[PDB]
């Protein structure tokens, strides 16, 4: 199983449909990796919308925008999984489960690119 875009999507779709609240920590760790990899499939310009969608999904206040956006930004810019590993280490299991559940609920339905020019062109191709 090679980690193509489609395999990534199929993996995300599978786990999005799981209730991971009782998942083994080892699998949860891998899901954080999945979320990080998937985050990096979004243009940087889309991270604000990703954050906003997360807040709405989870009924979180706007005062939570800063920390949530920061997580997405630092996953997006992560090198060698450094931030990802720090996040895993620092956060409690429950927080990680909730974040990953939320991400998998929103990531598949959110556009990965926002650029109007780009969106226009691609629309004429979609079958």
């Amino acid at each position: 199983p090679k980690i193509t875009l489609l395999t990534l999507i199929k993996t995300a779709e599978h786990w999005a449909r799981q209730d991971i609240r009782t998942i083994e920590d080892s699998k949860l760790r891998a899901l954080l990796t999945l979320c990080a990899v998937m985050t990096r499939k979004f243009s940087k310009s889309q991270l604000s919308l990703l954050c906003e969608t997360h807040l709405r999904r989870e009924g979180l206040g706007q005062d939570q925008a800063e920390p949530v956006l920061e997580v997405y930004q630092r996953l997006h810019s992560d090198k060698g999984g450094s931030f990802e590993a720090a996040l895993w280490q620092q956060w409690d299991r429950q927080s990680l489960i909730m974040f990953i559940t939320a991400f998998l609920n929103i990531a598949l339905q959110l556009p990965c690119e926002s650029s109007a020019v780009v969106v226009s062109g691609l629309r004429t191709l979609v079958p």
Binding site: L60, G61, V68, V71, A86, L87, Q90, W91, F99
Partner: peptide, 13 residues
């Protein structure tokens, strides 16, 4: 060095 941000706080029910 930049500390890991805290997880979001959920509203109390």
């Amino acid at each position: 060095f930049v500390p890991v941000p805290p997880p979001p706080l959920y509203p109390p029910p």
